[PDB]
């Protein structure tokens, strides 16, 4: 005999709305990454990205907890001028508020290509203004 | 409906109507394969058993071919050492078709 394994047509997903107003960055983020892989689910497969279809409801107000924030400064060096270059903790929630969650679940996903297919299943939008009214999201408290 | 039984030192999941292949039997085509070493049947519903080789159960089958397979090759190699080796083995089998497994 041989084992059953997943196929791209069989994947269910379903739609989830994640309240983020009671929450903190990582306890949403590692639970969300887990669901977002299909590791919340029975995958039974090494190569099909299953996951949930995830609406994050807000995350515009997500605290990091404790003093690690003011040295979490989202480091990059695009190609110019001596120094490391930086971006505040304060921008990433105050402006484009999705990004704080996006690059929190990102490093929890495998290599290049399959993590790019895992990643593109999350949306956060601006906050308390989500557009997935018509799918009927199932509320989740974490 | 699905069930699990032991062919020998390997254990096999199988369903009703399934033709499956397993490690070699003595038994020929024109004779009956039957398993009382069915460990549970996963039936229509959740099964509650402790003690296996379930006495109110059978998986009834028949032989449909006894043969030997394709020739596989096994390659052993490690570089810079002038170590290269090859072996073959073919392995015997039996095909069974399952009629049993009650509802």
């Amino acid at each position: 005999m041989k084992t059953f394994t997943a196929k791209p047509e069989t994947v269910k997903r379903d739609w989830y709305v994640v309240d983020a107003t009671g929450k903190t960055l990582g306890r949403l983020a590692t639970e969300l990454a887990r669901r977002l892989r299909g590791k919340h689910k029975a995958e039974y497969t090494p190569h099909v990205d299953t996951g949930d279809y995830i609406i994050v409801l807000n995350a515009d107000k997500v605290a990091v907890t404790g003093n690690k924030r003011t040295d979490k400064v989202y480091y990059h060096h695009t190609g110019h001028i001596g120094g490391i270059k930086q971006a505040t903790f304060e921008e990433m929630i105050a402006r484009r508020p999705e990004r704080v969650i996006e690059i929190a679940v990102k490093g929890m996903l495998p290599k290049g290509p399959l993590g790019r297919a895992m990643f593109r299943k999350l949306k956060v939008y601006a906050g308390n203004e989500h557009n997935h009214a018509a799918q009927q999201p199932q509320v989740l408290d974490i | 409906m699905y069930a699990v039984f032991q062919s020998g030192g390997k254990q096999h999941r199988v369903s009703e109507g399934q033709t499956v292949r397993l490690e070699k039997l003595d038994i020929a085509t024109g004779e009956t394969v039957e398993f009382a070493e069915v460990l549970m049947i996963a039936n229509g519903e959740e099964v509650k058993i402790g003690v296996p080789f379930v006495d109110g159960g059978v998986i009834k089958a028949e032989v449909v071919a006894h043969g030997r397979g394709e020739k596989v090759k096994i390659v052993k190699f490690r570089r810079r050492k002038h170590y290269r080796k090859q072996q073959g083995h073919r392995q015997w089998f039996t095909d069974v078709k399952i009629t049993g497994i009650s509802a």
């Binding site: 084992t3 | 959740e46 402790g50």
Partner: protein, 117 residues
């Protein structure tokens, strides 16, 4: 007795370029790179003869995990409850019922959590 040299090798050559059917570029049209590819191919295959079973085993365990946790027990606590519970060999490869027909699997799990000590 002048021997020609190579009327044996024409048959080793074409077996190799046939085994090298489906490969990119020189591995399929140039004998030197065909020979290289056959050796690495069969080494990879041979690590993955064993490696396939370990990889899948990760998946056998994680599908049983989602099932069990929907049934409010953690996987290791369920397996130790079933171990403590009387006989049954069970298997990690067992639950076809985790992804489809999911009505079932609860009775074993429910037994194991209770028997736990």
């Amino acid at each position: 007795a002048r021997v020609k040299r190579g009327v044996i090798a024409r048959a080793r050559h074409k077996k190799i370029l046939k085994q090298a059917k489906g490969y990119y570029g020189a591995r399929s049209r140039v004998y030197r790179v065909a020979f290289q590819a056959v050796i690495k191919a069969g080494q990879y295959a041979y690590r993955d003869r064993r490696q396939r079973k370990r990889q899948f085993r990760q998946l056998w365990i994680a599908r049983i995990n989602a099932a069990a946790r929907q049934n409010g027990i953690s996987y290791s606590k369920f397996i130790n409850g079933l171990k403590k519970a009387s006989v049954e060999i069970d298997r990690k490869i067992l639950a076809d019922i985790a992804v489809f027909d999911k009505v079932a699997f609860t009775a074993l799990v429910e037994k194991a959590k209770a028997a736990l000590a």
